[PDB]
Design an enzyme around this catalytic site. Structure first.
Site, PDB file in Angstrom:
ATOM      1  N   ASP A 174      -0.370  -3.405   1.786  1.00 52.53           N
ATOM      2  CA  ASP A 174       0.383  -2.870   2.929  1.00 52.53           C
ATOM      3  C   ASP A 174       1.170  -1.612   2.607  1.00 52.53           C
ATOM      4  O   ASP A 174       1.755  -1.055   3.529  1.00 52.53           O
ATOM      5  CB  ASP A 174       1.423  -3.875   3.374  1.00 52.53           C
ATOM      6  CG  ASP A 174       0.776  -5.057   4.027  1.00 52.53           C
ATOM      7  OD1 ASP A 174      -0.375  -4.893   4.412  1.00 52.53           O
ATOM      8  OD2 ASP A 174       1.519  -5.902   4.494  1.00 52.53           O
ATOM      9  N   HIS A 198      -7.260  -0.687   4.357  1.00 56.59           N
ATOM     10  CA  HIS A 198      -6.228  -1.735   4.386  1.00 56.59           C
ATOM     11  C   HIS A 198      -6.848  -3.073   4.720  1.00 56.59           C
ATOM     12  O   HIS A 198      -6.131  -4.056   4.730  1.00 56.59           O
ATOM     13  CB  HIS A 198      -5.138  -1.441   5.437  1.00 56.59           C
ATOM     14  CG  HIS A 198      -4.099  -2.563   5.657  1.00 56.59           C
ATOM     15  ND1 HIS A 198      -4.013  -3.271   6.778  1.00 56.59           N
ATOM     16  CD2 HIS A 198      -3.142  -2.999   4.771  1.00 56.59           C
ATOM     17  CE1 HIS A 198      -3.047  -4.140   6.579  1.00 56.59           C
ATOM     18  NE2 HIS A 198      -2.530  -3.976   5.375  1.00 56.59           N
TER      19      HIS A 198
END
Length: 121
Positions: A89, A47
């Site tokens: 996300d 991420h």
């Protein structure tokens, strides 16, 4: 933005995003990308690479509009950066839910510094 990020993670993961992943392991949490301790980590390790490929926007401040349509997060931003950041996300919120079985809570708050080195994004 983190106001969005958390909403998906609390939605997808079912947990409170600050106590479960605010500081869990080498990568998740605060400043720093160490080397993944386990998978509910490397979900964060990636991420953070995801985030560092973006340019027309701030990964932590810009807000976008995503949806929780029939138990799924769906982005509709058109902004090539707000949209490609939503996805970023969206994927961790899932990976983080995904590897919720290997989740270990010994790491809830790990001594960051005492952590391996990060690979290159």
């Amino acid at each position: 933005s983190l106001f969005e990020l958390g909403k998906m993670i609390l939605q997808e993961t079912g947990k409170n995003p600050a106590k479960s992943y605010g500081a869990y392991g080498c990568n998740c949490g605060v400043l720093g990308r160490g080397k993944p301790k386990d998978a509910t980590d490397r979900c964060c390790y990636v991420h953070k690479c995801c985030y560092k490929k973006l340019t027309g926007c701030n990964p932590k401040k810009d807000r976008y509009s995503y949806s929780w349509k029939d138990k799924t997060i769906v982005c509709g931003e058109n902004n090539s950066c707000l949209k490609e950041l939503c996805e970023c996300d969206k994927a961790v919120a899932i990976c983080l839910r995904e590897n919720l079985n290997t989740y270990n809570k010994k790491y809830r708050y790990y001594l960051k510094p005492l952590c391996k080195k990060a690979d290159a994004c």
